[PDB]
From Swiss-Prot:
The chain holds residues 671 to 920 of 920 of the full protein. Changing C115Y: In AIS; loss of androgen binding and of transactivation. Composed of three domains: a modulating N-terminal domain, a DNA-binding domain and a C-terminal ligand-binding domain. In the presence of bound steroid the ligand-binding domain interacts with the N-terminal modulating domain, and thereby activates AR transcription factor activity. Agonist binding is required for dimerization and binding to target DNA. The transcription factor activity of the complex formed by ligand-activated AR and DNA is modulated by interactions with coactivator and corepressor proteins. Changing R105C: In AIS; frequent mutation; loss of androgen binding. This is Androgen receptor. It comes from Homo sapiens. Changing S122P: In prostate cancer and AIS. Changing G81S: In prostate cancer. Changing F85L: In PAIS and prostate cancer.
């Protein structure tokens, strides 16, 4: 039986709300405030999800939180892209049921260019006819797609987990055609990284000037952004690509 897929379906988070007031006129401050609130809620869900993944708990405890925090942006971009595809056919960005970005919001959020890349990703789910199961497997693999260049505390086990998740993805594909499909999916996975990078830069810059634009940022998010994001931006932590960029 599809044991692995059963597990991924079983732990997949349900709907997560942003808590946005859609009765108020759109503003940079209100939109980013709601995105940050959504972020805090999504991080809680991602931690619970990751810890329930096959073999994840065998990683050193410190490596567990590190990989979750390094891969989070990518995971969220990919998941949001899928939500946009399944709910509004990639027409708009479905951050949450109560936070759907139309073109006006993409502009007002001052995150237009990033939104364009995220919507493009959403469109690929349609162009490549990505199945819900391929989505689940790829998303799980994204958790193991970005690490410190100098390695994790137990880098050896991480390598083993990543290998096994790649094998499961190849598995669903097999369940010349397979070769072409694996190529397409790994190319799609690689495309998430540059998008996450743009968002890492944006969120970092926003934190540094949050006091001037009235964003605030919840205490926990500010800590993660100030400690982990710069490691990525400075090159100490790098994404793992399938293909040479
Ligand atoms: C990830 C979100 C929410 C979920 C979603 O559907 C996609 C969306 C993409 C944009 C993110 C937005 C959250 C709020 C952001 C970014 C906040 O980044 C926090 C953060 C950044 C990290 F690199 C690691 C972490 F664990 C947490 C804001 O601070 C600026 C950009 C915002």
């Amino acid at each position: 039986q599809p044991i692995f897929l059963n597990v991924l379906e079983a732990i997949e988070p349900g709907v997560v709300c942003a808590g946005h007031d859609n009765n108020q006129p759109d503003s940079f401050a209100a939109l980013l405030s709601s995105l940050n609130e959504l972020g805090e809620r999504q991080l809680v869900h991602v931690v619970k999800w990751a810890k329930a993944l096959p073999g994840f708990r065998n990683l050193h405890v410190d490596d567990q939180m590190a990989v979750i925090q390094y891969s989070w942006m990518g995971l969220m971009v990919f998941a949001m892209g899928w939500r946009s595809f399944t709910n509004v056919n990639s027409r708009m960005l479905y951050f949450a049921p109560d936070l759907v970005f139309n073109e006006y919001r993409m502009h007002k959020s001052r995150m237009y260019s990033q939104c364009v890349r995220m919507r493009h990703l959403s469109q690929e789910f349609g162009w490549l006819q990505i199945t819900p199961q391929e989505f689940l497997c790829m998303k799980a693999l994204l958790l193991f797609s970005i690490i410190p260049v100098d390695g994790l505390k137990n880098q050896k086990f991480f390598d083993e987990l990543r290998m096994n998740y790649i094998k499961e993805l190849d598995r669903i594909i097999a369940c010349t055609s397979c070769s072409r499909r694996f190529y397409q999916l790994t190319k799609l996975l690689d495309s998430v990284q540059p998008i996450a990078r743009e968002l890492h830069q944006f969120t970092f810059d926003l934190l540094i000037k949050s006091h001037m634009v009235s964003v605030d940022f919840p205490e926990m998010m500010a800590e993660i952004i100030s400690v982990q994001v710069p490691k990525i931006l400075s090159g100490k932590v790098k994404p793992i690509y399938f293909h040479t960029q």
